[PDB]
Design a protein around this ligand. Structure first.
Ligand SMILES: COC(=O)c1coc([C@@H](CO)NC(=O)C(C)(C)C)n1
Length: 339
């Protein structure tokens, strides 16, 4: 479709201009008040902050440079910021500022107050097929955009899909995203969502994102993932067998789509054939989807999250509140020069 082709050609031009000349050093820590920790990991955390002059709220991801180095995430953190400052799509969380100091790296993102899809899915149990399809369509369009820019996302899971004030998705966490024209090799992603070729240590490509979409759609519509088991080794055995059991409540169209996304042979997997994403967009499970209306945000969402305003944290959970310490000495300056 020439209109889609021309849209994607412009998207790639605009991405490349920012990719080749990345913004740097566009805010500083003492311009913000710290409000609350919204999540925390082995080298980073996300905190709600408020800009002291405008009053705007933001989600600030703070990465400790020394822990990034120890956990072998240098390149991944540089990928994340360089990609996020260069992309622009309705269903991606927007990076507003970035900066670093003696101790940390900071990415100041728009704050999405409705919470993770994960919380909502686990609360309700499972989504109906129309509800799962609304979210799936947004992921299909987002992956069409990213892949056209030669980006692989590599962290699709329900925790990374935030629900905005209109009930639409914002994908967050670009920590594993990478610009890859061909193959890449790093072992990364959560166990339930890993494609077989990642588990088997192969050179893999963008087809891993389409596999993960199959896992996500299955989990949204069933309430649990297709290769579930108690420990990773057992999850990995199920994935590489690719034997899947579908609930009888799944439609025949849903099972057919999922057999083609959860195809172990990556050379046969939907999204990775000659017709690319159009095998997915034209599949019968998506026959009711108006792709343009989804992109334009004209479809009424299945679910509007309950929250009181742009500062409400009630859809995220509670963590021990730790200091944001900044050393008097610069740490790991060389490794993070380009941030
Ligand atoms: C716009 O809002 C956000 O980007 C936002 C809100 O809360 C989060 C939290 C929990 O999802 N994430 C983390 O803390 C990680 C450490 C990356 C897992 N991100």
């Amino acid at each position: 479709q020439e209109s889609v082709k021309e849209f994607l050609a412009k998207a790639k031009e605009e991405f490349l201009k920012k990719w080749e000349s990345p913004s740097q050093n566009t805010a500083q820590l003492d311009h913000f008040d710290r409000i609350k920790t919204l999540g925390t990991g082995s080298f980073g955390r996300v905190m709600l902050v408020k800009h002291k002059e405008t009053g705007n709220h933001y989600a600030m991801k703070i990465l400790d440079k020394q822990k990034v180095v120890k956990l072998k995430q240098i390149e991944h953190t540089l990928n994340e910021k360089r990609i996020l400052q260069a992309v622009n799509f309705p269903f991606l969380v927007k990076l507003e500022f970035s900066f670093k100091d003696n101790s940390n790296l900071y990415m100041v993102m728009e704050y999405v107050p409705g919470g993770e899809m994960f919380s909502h899915l686990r609360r309700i149990g499972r989504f109906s097929e129309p509800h799962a399809r609304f979210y799936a369509a947004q992921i299909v369009l987002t992956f069409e955009y990213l892949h056209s820019l030669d980006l692989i996302y590599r962290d699709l899971k329900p925790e990374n899909l935030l629900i905005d004030q209109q009930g639409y998705i914002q994908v967050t966490d670009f920590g594993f995203a990478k610009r890859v024209k061909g193959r890449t090799w790093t072992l990364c992603g959560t166990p339930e969502y890993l494609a077989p070729e990642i588990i088997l240590s192969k050179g893999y490509n963008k087809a891993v994102d389409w596999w993960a979409l199959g896992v996500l759609i299955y989990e949204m519509a069933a309430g649990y993932p297709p290769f579930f088991a108690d420990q990773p080794i057992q999850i990995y055995e199920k994935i590489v067998s690719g034997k899947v059991r579908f609930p009888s409540h799944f439609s025949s169209d849903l099972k057919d789509l999922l057999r083609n996304l959860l195809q172990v042979d990556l050379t046969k997997r939907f999204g990775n054939l000659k017709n690319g994403v159009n095998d997915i967009k034209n599949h019968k499970w998506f026959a009711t989807t108006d792709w343009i209306a989804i992109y334009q945000r004209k479809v009424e969402a299945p679910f509007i999250p309950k929250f009181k305003g742009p500062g409400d944290t009630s859809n995220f959970d509670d963590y021990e509140e730790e200091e944001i310490r900044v050393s008097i000495n610069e740490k790991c300056g060389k490794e993070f020069t380009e941030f």
